[PDB]
Amino acid sequence: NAQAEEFKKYLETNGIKPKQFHKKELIFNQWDPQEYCIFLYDGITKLTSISENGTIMNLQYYKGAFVIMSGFIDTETSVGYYNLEVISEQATAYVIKINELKELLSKNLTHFFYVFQTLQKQVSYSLAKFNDFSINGKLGSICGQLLILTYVYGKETPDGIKITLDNLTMQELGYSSSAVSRIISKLKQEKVIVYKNSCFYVQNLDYLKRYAPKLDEWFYLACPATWGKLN
Amino acid sequence: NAQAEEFKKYLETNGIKPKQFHKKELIFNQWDPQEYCIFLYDGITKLTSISENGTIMNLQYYKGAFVIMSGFIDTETSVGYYNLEVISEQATAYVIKINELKELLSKNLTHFFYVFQTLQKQVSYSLAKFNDFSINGKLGSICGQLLILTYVYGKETPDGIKITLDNLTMQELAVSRIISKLKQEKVIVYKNSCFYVQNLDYLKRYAPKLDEWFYLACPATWGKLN
Numbered sequence: 001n002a003q004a005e006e007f008k009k010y011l012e013t014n015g016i017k018p019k020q021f022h023k024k025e026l027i028f029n030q031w032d033p034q035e036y037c038i039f040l041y042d043g044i045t046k047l048t049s050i051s052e053n054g055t056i057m058n059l060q061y062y063k064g065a066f067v068i069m070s071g072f073i074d075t076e077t078s079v080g081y082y083n084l085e086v087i088s089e090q091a092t093a094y095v096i097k098i099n100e101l102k103e104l105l106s107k108n109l110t111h112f113f114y115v116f117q118t119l120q121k122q123v124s125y126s127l128a129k130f131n132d133f134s135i136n137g138k139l140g141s142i143c144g145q146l147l148i149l150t151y152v153y154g155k156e157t158p159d160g161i162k163i164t165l166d167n168l169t170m171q172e173l174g175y176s177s178s179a180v181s182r183i184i185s186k187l188k189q190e191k192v193i194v195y196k197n198s199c200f201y202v203q204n205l206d207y208l209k210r211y212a213p214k215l216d217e218w219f220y221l222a223c224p225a226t227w228g229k230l231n
Numbered sequence: 232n233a234q235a236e237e238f239k240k241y242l243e244t245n246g247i248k249p250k251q252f253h254k255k256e257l258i259f260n261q262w263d264p265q266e267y268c269i270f271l272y273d274g275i276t277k278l279t280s281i282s283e284n285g286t287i288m289n290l291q292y293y294k295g296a297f298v299i300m301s302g303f304i305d306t307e308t309s310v311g312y313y314n315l316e317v318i319s320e321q322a323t324a325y326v327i328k329i330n331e332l333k334e335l336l337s338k339n340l341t342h343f344f345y346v347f348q349t350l351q352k353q354v355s356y357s358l359a360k361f362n363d364f365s366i367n368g369k370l371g372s373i374c375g376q377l378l379i380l381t382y383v384y385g386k387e388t389p390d391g392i393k394i395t396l397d398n399l400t401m402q403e404l405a406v407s408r409i410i411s412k413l414k415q416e417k418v419i420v421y422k423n424s425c426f427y428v429q430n431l432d433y434l435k436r437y438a439p440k441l442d443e444w445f446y447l448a449c450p451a452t453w454g455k456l457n
């Protein structure tokens with residue numbers, strides 16, 4: 001969608017050129033002292049964290065049109081020690097040094113507001129996930145994850161709502177852990193979801209909405225174009 | 232925060248007056264169609280949510296100084312249906328309509344950046360909590376909440392690090408058992424009615440990404456007890 005399309009144009013007129021990235025590649029890593037503003041234009045990515053013994057923790061997933069910042073704009077100090085890994089086959093992104101971003105948004109307030117809103121989206125998304133987790137536990141978390149998958153990559157055809165994520169990206173969010181299985185197993189049993197033609201389908205959406213009401217509220221409030229397509 | 236001190240001054244020169252709030256009092260509620268920007272200057276608050284069946288869910292806690300926004304800056308639409316309840320005895324806050332903020336920040340960039348950071352702060356805090364929960368489960372969650380309590384309201388005295396939260400706020404707080412284990416290992420202790428910290432390392436062990444966040448987000452305060 002568009003506010004982001006205007007930003008892409010803005011960055012290009014200001015000399016920031018797009019860069020191509022592939023699967024498993026890192027846009028930025030934990031140890032990089034250079035702080036950035038990553039305008040992920042197209043693709044899917046994950047924000048990871050490496051514990052001191054080396055175990056990799058998946059923290060957040062971002063889709064292609066979004067901003068990710070490893071530095072604070074005011075102080076230009078690290079927001080945290082993270083890695084921004086690419087998950088999709090290919091991804092396009094504009095890598096900007098945190099200090100240029102300061103200037104680009106200073107010059108242009110429409111874009112300052114766009115990036116500012118994205119943070120507001122991030123904050124509220126987290127609170128929505130958390131609310132649903134607090135009420136329904138792991139069930140709320142899963143339905144929530146399935147609901148975002150549904151709205152963002154779903155389209156209606158005879159056999160329910162098809163998740164159009166290349167199953168290779170869904171192996172990074174498994175078809176296949178086992179209380180998840182207790183849940184995912186139950187959802188298959190109830191005909192809420194179905195695994196038939198190497199794709200996951202959704203046959204009971206009202207159910208997902210029921211057990212992920214705050215996330216459902218978030219989509220409607222944060223990005224209403226996407227929410228309206230299935231409502 | 233000096234940055235927040237400058238913001239207080241800015242809002243007052245711009246005619247926004249401070250308002251006093253007491254315990255259980257709501258700055259804003261979920262049914263208010265007016266979106267706001269709450270510059271919580273002094274006090275402690277909680278961001279709650281009421282489920283359709285009436286059950287109250289505590290989602291996040293905020294300390295005086297910080298900004299909380301119920302609306303998106305440009306579109307001016309609800310960010311979510313929440314309540315901002317006061318939990319401390321008394322709280323001071325500048326309640327500003329969202330549209331007012333839009334015009335206010337548009338005329339001073341230093342302050343636009345300050346509020347923008349606050350969001351960045353929030354985002355990374357959530358990811359830190361989550362990382363620690365993902366590794367250590369609720370043990371990571373509790374050590375994390377105890378670590379926050381320690382750094383923000385802790386002071387060194389002979390019997391460990393004293394949590395200087397009026398016990399009344401400490402009641403705002405299956406297994407009381409983690410906490411039992413912590414009390415057994417002399418990580419924390421509950422005489423004299425206060426909560427002490429004897430093994431700050433244990434908390435940092437199981438909530439390590441939260442510790443990292445406090446080091447980067449509040450460095451001066453972090454270096455006080457380290």
Ligand SMILES: NC(=O)CC[C@H](N)C(=O)O
Nearest residue numbers: 293294296297352353356
């Ligand atoms: N000074 C503060 O209250 C910081 C708040 C912190 N970012 C939080 O999410 O709780």
Ligand SMILES: [Cl-]
Nearest residue numbers: 059060061062
């Ligand atoms: Cl996510």
Ligand SMILES: [Cl-]
Nearest residue numbers: 290291292293
């Ligand atoms: Cl919190």
